[PDB]
A paper describes a structure:
Phospholipases D (PLDs, EC 3.1.4.4) belong to the [name] superfamily and they are ubiquitously distributed in various organisms including mammals, plants and microorganisms. PLDs catalyze two kinds of reactions: (1) hydrolysis reaction, in which PLDs cleave the terminal phosphodiester bonds of phospholipids to produce phospholipid acids (PA) and the free alcohol moieties, and (2) transphosphatidylation reaction, in which PLDs transfer phosphatidic acids to acceptor alcohol moieties to form new phospholipids. In the aspect of protein structure, members in the PLD superfamily contain one or two highly conserved HxKxxxxDxxxxxxGG/S (HKD) motifs, which were assumed to act as active centers. The catalytic mechanism of PLD enzymes was well characterized to proceed through a phosphohistidine intermediate that was formed after nucleophilic attack of the phospho-substrate by the first His residue of the HKD motif (H116 in SpPLD).
In the present study, the crystal structure of a PLD from the plant-associated bacteria [name] strain [name] was solved at 1.79 Angstrom (Å) resolution. Crystal structure of the ligand-free SpPLD was obtained at 1.79 Å resolution by the single-wavelength anomalous diffraction (SAD) method. Two molecules were found in one asymmetric unit, and the root-mean square deviation (RMSD) value of 307 backbone Cα between the two molecules was 0.126 Å. The overall structure of SpPLD displayed a β-α-β-α-β- sandwich fold. The two HKD domains self-dimerized in close proximity to form a single active site with the catalytic histidine (H116, H311) and lysine residues (K118, K313). The two catalytic histidine residues of the HKD motifs in SpPLD were both located at the interface of the two core β-sheets at the distance of 6.7 Å. While superimpostion and comparision the structure of SpPLD with other PLDs within the same family, an extended loop between β9 and α9 was found distinct with other PLDs. Moreover, electrostatic surface potential of SpPLD at this part showed net charge of +1, thus this loop was found positively charged.
Residue numbers in the entry: -4 to 383
Write the structure that this text describes.
Amino acid sequence: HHHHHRFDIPGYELVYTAPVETALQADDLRNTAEVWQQMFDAAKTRIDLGQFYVANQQGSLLDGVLQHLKAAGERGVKIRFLMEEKGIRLSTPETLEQLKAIPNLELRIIPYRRLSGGILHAKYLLVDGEQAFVGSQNFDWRALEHIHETGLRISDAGVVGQIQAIFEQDWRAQALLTADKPVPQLTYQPTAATPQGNYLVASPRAYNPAGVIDSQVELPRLLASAKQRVRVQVMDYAPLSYGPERSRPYYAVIDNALRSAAARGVQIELMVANWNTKKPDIAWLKSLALVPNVQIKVVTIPPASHGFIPFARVIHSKLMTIDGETAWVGTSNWTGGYLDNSRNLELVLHSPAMSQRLDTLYSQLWDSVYAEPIKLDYDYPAPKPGGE
């Protein structure tokens, strides 16, 4: 059993990268780079990628990923790569040129703010309309090596079809925006039946194809249904949006649901990155730590031995388990901007098997030397994710 090197439930495989040089390895989960390479190798017709940005360093694991993507293009696979305009400033320009040089690849840059005010933040892949990948992993060499990252390879046809429809929607929207043509909003047509089983949730509502569950509705519904324990891991948690003139207006949707669950006696566990201990966010995090039944830990991943790496050595997985029975694996941090006005994707799996494996992964981090309880009395130094 022990030497089985992957974890699946029907329709879903759990895919995981631990930072190198940490006690966070999971030999039973396939890692991001190996899964992406195999997904590209299996492509016979189409590969679609929706990404926030593209960042590379010569000699990284992303080089192999890009090699397999290029080989797919050379094989005659049509590749459509959609990236957020705000991601350009985060991207490696040479890597963007390499992508454009792949045969049969079209690269489109979408300013998703012209649609809903936020960004294309989702990180996902589609192969032949048959398989998808959704996860925290950016198209970034650091996501493959230096960051705690979690995603799902999806073969559930219904869900893949919805992700494909979202990609098609945003691809065509990019072309309409380029021509200064209107992008019509999509009618909100929710199914009256309560969601069951395994399903996609997505944002923003206004550009969700028919029948795609609005994540901003579903996350509070899921939290309202919790009876015993909610465990959450994000990079960032804040009841705040990023507004004009650097303002940070209050954002209540998620925080109300967590506080409501806590008030019903549900135990809340929350893990965030040390990057989240910046001001003002740390004050609100301390505020949440005083709520009954809430425990918060801050996770610090140590630097890699060869030296400081900007915007790396951090936890990035966006995970939730409810009652050890329901699992959430998403692209969104839990602040304003993600579920309301940005393109994000989250998977909800009412799967005891997946929830148990995710709870083991969560406990591994929670119980590690990298996680420590929030300290109410401590003046957290400004994180310097970029350095110094």
